[PDB]
Amino acid sequence: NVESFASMLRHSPLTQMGPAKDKLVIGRIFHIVENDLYIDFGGKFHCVCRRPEVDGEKYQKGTRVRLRLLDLELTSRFLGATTDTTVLEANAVLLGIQES
Amino acid sequence: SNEDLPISMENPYKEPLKKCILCGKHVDYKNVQLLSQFVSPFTGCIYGRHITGLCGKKQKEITKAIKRAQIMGFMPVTYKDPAYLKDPKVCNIRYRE
Amino acid sequence: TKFSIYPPIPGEESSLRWAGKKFEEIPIAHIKASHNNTQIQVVSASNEPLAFASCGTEGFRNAKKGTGIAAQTAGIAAAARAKQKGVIHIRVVVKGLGPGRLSAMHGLIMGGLEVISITDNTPIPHXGCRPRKARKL
Amino acid sequence: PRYELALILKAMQRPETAATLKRTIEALMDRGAIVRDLENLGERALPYRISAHSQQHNRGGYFLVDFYAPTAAVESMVEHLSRDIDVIRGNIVKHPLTQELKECEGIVPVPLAEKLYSTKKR
Amino acid sequence: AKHLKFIARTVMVQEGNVESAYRTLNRILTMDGLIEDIKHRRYYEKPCRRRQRESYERCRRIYNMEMARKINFLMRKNRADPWQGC
RNA sequence: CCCCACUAUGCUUAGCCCUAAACCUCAACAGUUAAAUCAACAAAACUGCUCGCCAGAACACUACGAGCCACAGCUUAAAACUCAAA
Ligand code: FES
Ligand SMILES: [K+]
Ligand SMILES: [K+]
Ligand SMILES: [Mg+2]
Ligand SMILES: [Mg+2]
Ligand SMILES: [Mg+2]
Ligand SMILES: [Mg+2]
Ligand SMILES: [Mg+2]
Ligand SMILES: [Mg+2]
Ligand SMILES: [Mg+2]
Ligand SMILES: [Mg+2]
Ligand SMILES: [Mg+2]
Ligand SMILES: [Mg+2]
């Protein structure tokens, strides 16, 4: 009675989410560069969001935040290209901090 | 076999196709008010579809209606009739800075 | 009220006035900006001529006529003769893309006239006469 | 077939305007037309000055005549309107309501064209 | 000639600012294509030459809009190096 | 070559003439994207089938013959001499 991969995939939160556009997700700040916050939210790629002007000092490494997802992976095919160009990061909007 | 395998079907999350603001509406050469919304106020020039946002079918219908109305005596050619300057702005163009 | 760049429409009831005169009553400065000359005629709203000046009538000759400072001088000359006749506010109708298109308007202002509107009437045929053949340079 | 006559009439008093409309609808009937409706769009300023029959016009009465006629009546009616001195401009078009508008599902997006050039290294 | 006058290509001057009115008019005529049209009409452009110009202008628009689309897409990556030293 | 003037001509009607880098220099129909992908460049490489066309350069959009409302024309189209290249 070993669970199959097809079963794991069907019942994963990422599969159950459906499309990612305009979906609220919880992220975690794992890397910070100046006012650039690198946030992991459970997907393949992280998103990079600028430090908010209000309560900027509350956003630190490990701080859990609320995001509105736009794309899991930013990719596009440009004129003459044989494959899609990927920037290797997700597109998301940082809304604020998640609190209990 | 296995219940958890994916099933073949059509995309359930597919968004409905977008429609032009004139989709499903009749474009008549006598409706000069509508046609005037797709000409330049200062020169009367017909706007291209990249400004009007119309589909190819309606860009043609609007264009043919404008040309018919102009030469039949319903619509001016060299300027937008001033009566229609306060109508809704549906075209994506700004002439003031 | 907010400013409208669109001119007042004749027959409608506007509140805009210039020295107690309506837009339909303001004299007109006709500027013809050619490639080799600039001609300026100021006329009344009833089409009465009031002043005429061109780069040629201001003593400029040949290629000097087709310059900005030459048109500016022609504008000042027409403004002077027009101001003597009682003109302060003018509607500018400029046809042509010559060098004296804008400079001719400056001369009208430096000459004491107030421009209340600018109209382009450069002739554009909608299909018309075949222009002369291109130049080999 | 079904046609629509867009009729711009000289700005006149009510009695002369009715005589012109009656004279124009009777001309259609004499040519075999079945007149369906007559609509008044109102007197208005023309979009531009129109010279017709040695006169200059700035205002006109806009009228529509919906009618059915044989195909050969159109050419004969156009000639009749050219001679009526009270008509500024008269045009006969195929009635727009006859043409049925096909349904539209929406805008089908166009993907960027692919494989226009070989993938060899240049 | 048969149309009403002082409606087409007419801009009103605000507070005696004639320079801004002329710039606005010039911007109107440019965006509507009249300036380039007037210039191209000074000498007759033969049809073969017109077709070549339109083709060149259309291919330039496609290239310029596609390069602009790629610049905007990659502009987010112009941020400071997150992994400096590695 | 640059500027000005003006004609044949560009337009209509009625007949001719039948030529273009008439070239998107990429024939029609049907099919494939796997194998060896493929001289180069150009607009990726091929299969079936059919018609048309091609066989060193130049002589030669020529000569002669023939046909044509064409009479300084068009279509078809060689040879001799010459070269070891084109
Ligand atoms: S999108 Fe349906 S008619 Fe324009
Ligand atoms: K040929
Ligand atoms: K070619
Ligand atoms: Mg001649
Ligand atoms: Mg003709
Ligand atoms: Mg061709
Ligand atoms: Mg060939
Ligand atoms: Mg064949
Ligand atoms: Mg095929
Ligand atoms: Mg040979
Ligand atoms: Mg030949
Ligand atoms: Mg021969
Ligand atoms: Mg012979």
XYZ file of C-alpha atoms (C1' of nucleotides) and ligand atoms in Angstrom:
644
model
C 0.000 0.000 0.000
C 2.644 2.494 -1.135
C 1.249 5.808 -2.350
C 1.915 6.433 -6.035
C 3.279 9.616 -7.572
C 0.002 10.214 -9.416
C -1.725 10.250 -6.025
C 0.771 12.678 -4.484
C 0.336 15.011 -7.453
C -3.469 14.954 -7.387
C -3.663 15.829 -3.677
C -0.849 18.383 -3.521
C -1.843 21.932 -2.490
C -0.121 23.297 -5.599
C -2.249 21.066 -7.830
C -5.397 21.875 -5.844
C -4.719 25.615 -6.172
C -5.426 25.596 -9.904
C -4.287 28.688 -11.793
C -1.937 30.932 -9.851
C -3.168 34.309 -11.122
C -4.740 36.370 -8.332
C -4.216 33.695 -5.673
C -3.268 34.667 -2.132
C -0.336 32.630 -0.811
C 1.917 32.743 2.243
C 5.612 33.299 1.573
C 8.782 33.263 3.655
C 11.669 35.701 3.274
C 14.895 33.712 2.913
C 17.267 36.265 1.349
C 17.435 40.072 1.419
C 19.527 42.379 -0.785
C 19.194 46.017 0.287
C 15.443 46.606 -0.162
C 14.914 43.516 -2.361
C 13.084 40.699 -0.566
C 13.465 37.163 -1.929
C 10.365 35.232 -0.887
C 9.708 31.500 -1.184
C 6.028 30.529 -1.292
C 6.150 26.803 -2.087
C 6.614 26.996 -5.862
C 9.490 26.173 -8.170
C 10.825 29.742 -8.223
C 10.989 32.467 -5.614
C 9.572 35.943 -6.127
C 11.478 39.191 -5.570
C 9.518 42.019 -3.942
C 10.702 45.462 -2.868
C 10.622 46.289 0.831
C 7.349 48.120 1.616
C 7.666 51.752 2.648
C 5.504 51.248 5.757
C 6.956 49.006 8.482
C 9.933 48.204 6.275
C 11.996 47.060 9.257
C 9.453 44.341 10.095
C 10.430 42.447 6.919
C 13.423 40.296 7.868
C 14.842 36.900 6.979
C 12.280 34.298 7.992
C 9.373 36.742 8.169
C 6.237 35.170 6.725
C 4.297 37.409 4.349
C 1.148 37.470 2.234
C 1.477 37.491 -1.554
C -0.929 37.780 -4.470
C 0.438 35.512 -7.180
C 0.505 36.533 -10.836
C 2.710 33.890 -12.476
C 4.613 30.901 -11.122
C 7.345 31.476 -13.725
C 8.002 34.587 -15.799
C 8.646 33.365 -19.344
C 8.186 34.695 -22.856
C 9.222 33.786 -26.389
C 10.695 36.718 -28.301
C 11.045 37.380 -32.021
C 13.350 34.830 -33.632
C 13.819 32.740 -30.487
C 13.460 28.961 -30.675
C 12.612 28.610 -26.967
C 11.060 30.753 -24.249
C 13.220 33.162 -22.280
C 12.880 32.624 -18.527
C 14.123 34.949 -15.785
C 13.939 32.073 -13.263
C 11.639 33.872 -10.835
C 7.932 34.071 -10.089
C 5.774 37.185 -10.373
C 3.932 38.142 -7.188
C 2.688 41.223 -5.339
C 3.674 41.648 -1.693
C 0.603 42.658 0.313
C 1.953 42.654 3.864
C 2.932 40.490 6.826
C 1.059 37.431 8.075
C 0.325 37.461 11.806
C -1.377 35.144 14.282
C -6.408 0.512 -13.321
C -5.683 3.518 -11.093
C -8.161 6.191 -10.031
C -5.570 8.926 -9.392
C -4.312 9.052 -12.983
C -5.068 12.237 -14.953
C -8.085 12.218 -17.260
C -8.388 13.629 -20.766
C -10.695 16.639 -21.076
C -10.816 20.289 -22.107
C -9.293 23.036 -19.983
C -11.876 23.797 -17.249
C -10.130 27.020 -16.167
C -9.955 28.464 -19.685
C -11.080 32.076 -19.694
C -13.798 33.139 -22.158
C -12.443 34.838 -25.253
C -12.302 38.611 -24.983
C -14.741 40.615 -27.090
C -14.519 44.066 -28.624
C -16.735 46.790 -27.190
C -18.864 46.472 -30.351
C -19.099 42.669 -30.412
C -22.676 41.686 -31.177
C -23.769 45.255 -31.972
C -24.880 46.623 -35.335
C -22.718 49.353 -36.877
C -24.891 51.632 -39.014
C -23.695 54.512 -41.174
C -26.593 56.601 -39.828
C -25.286 56.304 -36.248
C -22.865 59.196 -36.611
C -22.510 59.511 -32.834
C -20.958 56.041 -32.623
C -18.780 56.558 -35.697
C -17.528 59.890 -34.353
C -15.997 58.059 -31.376
C -13.486 56.459 -33.782
C -12.203 59.552 -35.620
C -9.663 62.141 -34.565
C -11.277 65.278 -33.088
C -8.818 67.641 -34.762
C -8.351 66.006 -38.180
C -11.255 63.576 -38.576
C -8.760 60.805 -39.316
C -10.045 57.284 -38.741
C -8.130 55.656 -35.895
C -6.332 52.388 -36.450
C -7.398 49.307 -34.539
C -4.416 49.663 -32.193
C -6.111 52.831 -30.894
C -9.782 51.848 -31.156
C -9.338 48.361 -29.705
C -11.826 46.918 -32.186
C -11.524 43.506 -33.782
C -10.762 43.207 -37.478
C -14.409 42.654 -38.372
C -15.607 45.759 -36.519
C -12.663 47.934 -37.548
C -13.732 47.236 -41.131
C -17.425 47.809 -40.409
C -16.629 51.087 -38.640
C -14.286 52.161 -41.440
C -16.794 51.348 -44.185
C -19.601 53.015 -42.225
C -17.547 56.188 -41.730
C -16.710 56.420 -45.434
C -20.340 55.859 -46.436
C -21.706 58.364 -43.916
C -19.135 60.998 -44.889
C -19.912 60.973 -48.618
C -23.684 60.553 -48.184
C -24.004 63.742 -46.128
C -24.267 62.458 -42.546
C -20.735 62.942 -41.189
C -18.000 65.569 -41.674
C -14.666 64.465 -43.096
C -12.052 66.960 -41.886
C -13.089 67.110 -38.218
C -15.154 65.370 -35.580
C -18.570 66.981 -35.270
C -18.321 69.167 -32.126
C -21.669 67.812 -30.910
C -19.914 64.505 -30.154
C -16.819 65.823 -28.352
C -18.268 65.051 -24.891
C -19.125 61.412 -25.650
C -17.374 58.536 -23.862
C -13.696 58.282 -24.776
C -13.218 54.669 -25.887
C -9.988 55.144 -27.875
C -6.483 54.846 -26.419
C -4.837 58.105 -27.469
C -3.933 61.314 -25.633
C -2.994 64.526 -27.451
C -2.338 66.759 -24.425
C 1.103 66.158 -22.853
C -14.514 76.168 -15.459
C -11.778 73.932 -16.845
C -9.836 75.042 -19.910
C -10.924 73.646 -23.281
C -8.458 73.490 -26.170
C -11.415 73.006 -28.516
C -12.568 76.326 -30.014
C -16.048 77.656 -29.219
C -18.645 76.452 -31.713
C -20.552 79.223 -33.543
C -24.230 79.499 -32.673
C -23.834 77.943 -29.231
C -23.795 80.118 -26.114
C -20.219 80.425 -24.868
C -18.971 82.712 -22.107
C -15.539 83.346 -23.641
C -14.898 86.922 -24.748
C -11.919 88.984 -25.907
C -12.354 92.742 -25.455
C -16.095 92.113 -25.523
C -15.855 90.274 -28.858
C -16.814 86.664 -29.507
C -14.530 84.114 -31.143
C -16.479 84.486 -34.399
C -15.646 88.222 -34.411
C -11.877 88.080 -33.799
C -9.740 88.979 -36.848
C -7.686 86.271 -38.536
C -3.953 86.227 -39.272
C -3.331 84.067 -42.346
C 0.271 82.814 -42.370
C 1.415 81.027 -45.528
C 4.753 79.424 -44.621
C 6.307 78.300 -47.895
C 9.733 76.718 -48.304
C 11.231 79.867 -49.863
C 9.010 82.631 -48.443
C 6.436 83.504 -45.790
C 3.314 85.578 -46.451
C 1.136 87.014 -43.677
C -2.268 88.630 -44.186
C -4.425 89.900 -41.322
C -8.136 90.060 -42.156
C -11.281 90.893 -40.234
C -13.947 88.331 -39.400
C -15.846 89.702 -42.421
C -12.816 89.073 -44.682
C -11.698 92.712 -44.834
C -7.918 92.944 -45.392
C -6.122 94.909 -42.686
C -2.397 94.288 -43.227
C -0.135 92.274 -45.508
C 3.555 91.501 -45.138
C 5.929 88.935 -46.600
C 9.659 88.328 -46.412
C 9.917 89.761 -49.920
C 8.134 92.991 -48.977
C 10.504 93.386 -46.000
C 13.607 93.616 -48.191
C 14.744 89.994 -47.959
C 15.808 88.355 -51.207
C 16.431 84.818 -52.495
C 17.551 82.306 -49.826
C 17.355 84.819 -46.972
C 13.570 84.941 -47.384
C 13.373 81.255 -46.476
C 14.613 81.749 -42.918
C 13.088 82.145 -39.485
C 14.366 85.637 -38.691
C 12.997 86.770 -42.054
C 9.513 85.512 -41.179
C 9.762 87.014 -37.692
C 10.467 90.376 -39.332
C 7.475 89.971 -41.649
C 5.236 89.209 -38.676
C 6.323 92.347 -36.828
C 5.591 94.403 -39.943
C 2.073 93.005 -40.358
C 1.373 93.351 -36.633
C 2.381 97.020 -36.724
C 0.017 97.856 -39.587
C -2.739 95.773 -37.980
C -2.374 97.310 -34.514
C -2.841 100.758 -36.052
C -6.207 99.544 -37.387
C -7.461 98.449 -33.961
C -6.372 94.791 -33.769
C -5.229 93.263 -30.476
C -6.456 89.657 -30.481
C -6.037 87.498 -33.586
C -6.809 83.951 -34.670
C -3.809 82.415 -36.441
C -4.368 80.161 -39.456
C -1.011 78.807 -40.655
C -0.698 76.725 -43.832
C 2.627 75.156 -44.745
C 5.660 73.629 -43.057
C 8.220 76.236 -44.081
C 10.828 77.736 -41.758
C 8.629 80.766 -41.053
C 5.744 78.698 -39.715
C 6.464 79.383 -36.031
C 8.751 82.405 -36.426
C 6.023 84.331 -38.249
C 3.802 83.856 -35.193
C 6.466 85.167 -32.810
C 6.702 88.339 -34.875
C 2.959 88.861 -34.521
C 3.272 88.619 -30.734
C 6.376 90.811 -30.526
C 4.442 93.314 -32.641
C 1.779 93.703 -29.958
C -0.881 91.150 -30.952
C -2.378 88.466 -28.712
C -2.872 85.047 -30.302
C -5.996 83.364 -28.922
C -5.919 80.261 -31.146
C -3.752 78.469 -33.697
C -5.228 76.688 -36.717
C -3.304 74.580 -39.223
C -4.676 74.654 -42.769
C -1.792 73.004 -44.597
C -3.364 71.540 -47.773
C -3.390 67.741 -47.719
C -5.012 66.227 -50.835
C -7.004 63.074 -50.143
C -5.662 61.133 -53.128
C -5.426 65.182 -55.958
C -2.674 66.309 -58.306
C 0.531 64.376 -58.887
C 3.484 66.307 -57.387
C 6.714 66.909 -59.278
C 9.216 64.063 -59.556
C 11.793 63.386 -56.840
C 15.212 65.059 -56.998
C 18.466 63.166 -57.618
C 20.974 64.494 -55.084
C -34.753 43.350 -52.940
C -35.041 45.500 -49.807
C -33.399 48.918 -50.075
C -32.974 52.010 -47.918
C -33.173 55.459 -49.509
C -31.218 58.054 -47.528
C -32.829 61.318 -48.619
C -31.575 64.823 -47.818
C -34.208 67.372 -48.841
C -33.945 71.124 -49.229
C -34.946 72.938 -46.047
C -38.529 73.973 -46.807
C -41.818 74.654 -45.072
C -44.055 71.761 -44.075
C -46.357 71.933 -47.148
C -43.537 71.820 -49.705
C -41.740 69.080 -47.762
C -44.828 66.857 -47.803
C -45.287 67.459 -51.534
C -41.678 66.413 -52.151
C -42.022 63.243 -50.069
C -45.307 62.318 -51.747
C -43.730 63.006 -55.142
C -40.739 60.825 -54.241
C -42.700 57.888 -52.816
C -45.014 57.911 -55.837
C -41.943 57.781 -58.080
C -40.865 54.621 -56.252
C -44.320 53.077 -56.644
C -44.432 53.937 -60.351
C -41.204 51.937 -60.753
C -42.624 48.854 -59.026
C -41.434 49.464 -55.467
C -43.327 48.387 -52.354
C -42.736 51.149 -49.816
C -42.516 49.808 -46.267
C -41.867 52.823 -44.029
C -40.954 56.507 -44.010
C -38.828 57.905 -41.183
C -38.037 61.528 -40.367
C -34.543 61.982 -38.934
C -35.056 65.718 -38.419
C -33.747 68.917 -39.944
C -30.096 69.566 -39.163
C -27.023 71.374 -40.402
C -25.248 69.473 -43.148
C -21.757 68.136 -42.342
C -20.464 70.361 -45.154
C -21.827 72.755 -47.742
C -23.549 70.997 -50.654
C -24.180 72.609 -54.042
C -27.190 71.151 -55.855
C -29.163 72.567 -58.788
C -27.393 75.939 -58.877
C -27.953 76.473 -55.143
C -25.829 76.263 -52.001
C -27.233 74.376 -49.013
C -26.245 74.424 -45.346
C -29.299 72.722 -43.800
C -31.464 69.847 -44.955
C -34.252 67.514 -43.968
C -33.059 63.950 -43.436
C -35.576 61.246 -44.351
C -35.464 57.481 -44.837
C -37.638 55.363 -47.125
C -37.595 51.610 -46.527
C -38.934 49.799 -49.572
C -38.744 46.682 -51.718
C -38.192 47.009 -55.458
C -36.876 45.006 -58.411
C -33.172 45.309 -59.106
C -33.870 47.327 -62.271
C -35.761 50.032 -60.351
C -32.665 51.299 -58.516
C -30.930 52.628 -61.629
C -34.146 54.316 -62.764
C -34.813 55.831 -59.332
C -31.312 57.304 -59.032
C -31.969 59.149 -62.294
C -35.279 60.489 -60.969
C -33.677 61.877 -57.806
C -30.976 63.664 -59.814
C -33.617 65.819 -61.539
C -35.744 66.780 -58.514
C -34.710 70.300 -57.521
C -35.913 69.831 -53.923
C -33.548 66.893 -53.275
C -30.067 67.831 -52.085
C -28.611 64.314 -52.018
C -30.319 60.950 -52.390
C -28.601 57.566 -52.135
C -30.083 54.066 -52.343
C -28.305 51.372 -50.331
C -29.175 47.767 -49.626
C -31.139 47.724 -46.395
C -28.743 47.073 -43.477
C -31.310 44.931 -41.642
C -31.318 42.334 -44.438
C -27.674 41.423 -43.840
C -27.653 39.072 -40.848
C -24.687 39.532 -38.517
C -22.823 36.289 -37.903
C -22.206 35.403 -34.275
C -18.766 36.140 -32.835
C -17.138 33.929 -30.213
C -14.551 36.571 -29.315
C -10.986 37.538 -30.144
C -8.816 34.531 -31.008
C -5.270 35.501 -29.944
C -2.494 35.223 -32.521
C 0.731 33.588 -31.272
C 4.086 34.930 -32.383
C 4.992 33.369 -35.724
C 7.471 30.511 -35.353
C 10.076 28.749 -37.500
C 10.390 31.649 -39.944
C 14.154 31.013 -40.064
C 16.141 27.789 -39.879
C 17.754 26.981 -36.534
C 21.273 26.867 -37.987
C 23.898 28.892 -36.141
C 24.612 32.187 -37.883
C -13.350 74.151 -48.532
C -16.968 73.157 -48.009
C -16.520 72.401 -44.307
C -16.917 74.775 -41.386
C -13.799 76.722 -40.452
C -11.912 76.988 -37.155
C -12.815 73.441 -36.087
C -10.221 71.216 -37.762
C -6.655 71.382 -36.432
C -7.517 74.276 -34.103
C -6.039 74.667 -30.615
C -6.947 77.442 -28.183
C -4.228 79.380 -26.368
C -4.199 79.381 -22.559
C -3.073 82.424 -20.564
C -1.247 83.791 -23.592
C 1.014 80.714 -23.698
C 1.386 80.465 -27.462
C 4.397 78.126 -27.327
C 2.456 75.406 -25.512
C -0.448 75.826 -27.936
C 1.850 75.444 -30.944
C 3.563 72.418 -29.401
C 0.153 70.866 -28.732
C -0.951 71.476 -32.322
C 2.317 70.083 -33.677
C 1.853 67.043 -31.435
C -1.680 66.570 -32.780
C -0.615 66.761 -36.425
C 2.303 64.385 -35.828
C 0.288 61.708 -34.022
C -2.384 61.764 -36.738
C 0.349 61.355 -39.360
C -0.215 64.656 -41.157
C 3.333 65.997 -40.800
C 4.998 62.930 -42.318
C 2.258 62.804 -44.958
C 2.768 66.444 -45.979
C 6.520 65.875 -46.238
C 6.196 62.696 -48.309
C 3.835 64.574 -50.657
C 6.324 67.297 -51.628
C 7.694 65.026 -54.368
C 5.869 62.131 -55.988
C 6.829 58.809 -54.407
C 6.460 56.178 -57.112
C 4.308 53.192 -56.072
C 7.194 50.704 -56.104
C 9.090 53.085 -53.808
C 6.066 53.585 -51.552
C 5.588 49.829 -51.163
C 9.254 49.425 -50.242
C 9.017 52.221 -47.668
C 5.859 50.783 -46.098
C 7.460 47.339 -45.916
C 10.567 48.805 -44.285
C 8.478 50.817 -41.821
C 6.318 47.816 -40.915
C 9.295 45.517 -40.334
C 10.922 48.210 -38.189
C 7.772 48.533 -36.074
C 7.677 44.773 -35.479
C 11.363 44.686 -34.545
C 11.177 47.807 -32.380
C 8.062 46.636 -30.537
C 9.556 43.176 -29.996
C 12.860 44.548 -28.699
C 10.956 46.926 -26.423
C 8.875 44.014 -25.131
C 12.056 42.114 -24.262
C 13.631 45.103 -22.498
C 10.585 45.598 -20.272
C 10.480 41.861 -19.560
C 14.145 41.760 -18.494
C 14.258 45.128 -16.709
C 13.354 43.569 -13.349
C 16.605 41.578 -13.504
C 18.659 44.804 -13.478
C 18.557 44.650 -9.663
C 21.730 44.311 -7.604
C 23.528 40.970 -7.687
C 22.007 38.754 -4.947
C 24.923 36.275 -4.984
C 27.913 38.614 -5.115
C 31.122 36.685 -4.511
C 29.769 33.400 -5.894
C 22.766 65.415 -62.522
C 20.165 71.206 -60.404
C 16.012 75.411 -61.797
C 11.892 77.174 -65.304
C 8.519 76.561 -69.538
C 6.044 73.308 -72.589
C 4.707 68.831 -75.934
C 4.107 63.315 -76.985
C 2.390 60.470 -73.067
C -0.275 59.254 -68.370
C -7.168 59.852 -68.751
C -11.967 58.375 -71.781
C -13.953 55.738 -76.157
C -12.956 52.181 -80.329
C -9.198 48.958 -82.243
C -4.012 47.306 -82.090
C 0.736 45.923 -79.921
C 1.747 41.065 -76.553
C 6.711 42.867 -73.824
C 8.885 43.256 -67.869
C 14.005 41.833 -62.307
C 5.667 39.577 -65.799
C 10.847 37.388 -59.701
C 7.715 35.539 -53.847
C 13.839 34.140 -59.874
C 11.227 28.668 -55.357
C 5.735 24.469 -61.158
C 0.778 21.546 -60.125
C -1.496 17.747 -56.967
C -0.832 14.494 -52.513
C 1.921 13.467 -48.110
C 5.929 13.513 -43.970
C 8.809 15.972 -39.851
C 11.830 10.061 -38.638
C 16.019 8.385 -40.295
C 21.783 10.572 -42.870
C 19.152 17.387 -40.686
C 22.098 19.797 -44.124
C 28.035 21.776 -49.905
C 27.545 27.497 -49.150
C 24.143 31.385 -48.926
C 19.040 32.112 -49.166
C 13.050 31.248 -47.229
C 14.771 23.831 -42.776
C 15.019 18.834 -44.935
C 12.388 15.381 -47.822
C 8.738 11.547 -50.303
C 5.069 10.032 -54.179
C 3.245 11.524 -59.030
C 2.858 14.542 -63.442
C 3.901 18.127 -67.009
C 7.397 21.997 -68.532
C 12.465 23.085 -68.910
C 18.198 22.567 -68.639
C 23.345 20.121 -70.400
C 30.999 24.867 -70.590
C 31.593 30.164 -71.759
C 30.938 33.673 -75.610
C 29.017 34.458 -80.379
C 23.287 35.226 -79.047
C 17.058 38.865 -76.146
C 21.929 37.608 -82.787
C 21.699 35.343 -88.350
C 18.344 32.694 -91.504
C 13.530 30.339 -91.899
C 8.417 30.599 -90.442
C 4.089 32.957 -88.075
C 1.840 37.433 -86.511
C -3.368 44.058 -87.503
C 3.133 43.635 -85.326
C 7.262 46.932 -90.794
C 13.453 50.498 -86.470
C 8.481 45.004 -83.863
C 7.457 40.322 -81.226
C 7.678 34.809 -80.838
C 10.701 30.465 -81.936
C 16.114 30.328 -82.508
C 21.246 28.335 -84.756
C 26.145 27.767 -86.829
C 31.269 29.175 -88.165
C 35.547 31.510 -86.112
C 37.339 32.154 -80.468
C 38.601 30.589 -75.354
C 40.335 27.119 -70.789
C 37.668 28.827 -68.570
C 32.950 31.159 -67.570
S -14.835 40.626 -31.004
Fe -16.789 39.924 -31.740
S -17.315 41.359 -33.326
Fe -15.465 42.166 -32.446
K 9.573 36.884 -69.602
K 11.460 39.691 -57.256
Mg -0.734 67.008 -72.852
Mg -10.115 58.844 -63.613
Mg 4.862 42.014 -60.479
Mg 10.703 32.657 -64.680
Mg 1.713 23.123 -64.486
Mg 2.090 20.338 -50.850
Mg 25.691 26.363 -73.835
Mg 13.614 41.573 -75.086
Mg 15.093 39.132 -83.075
Mg 13.696 37.552 -89.958
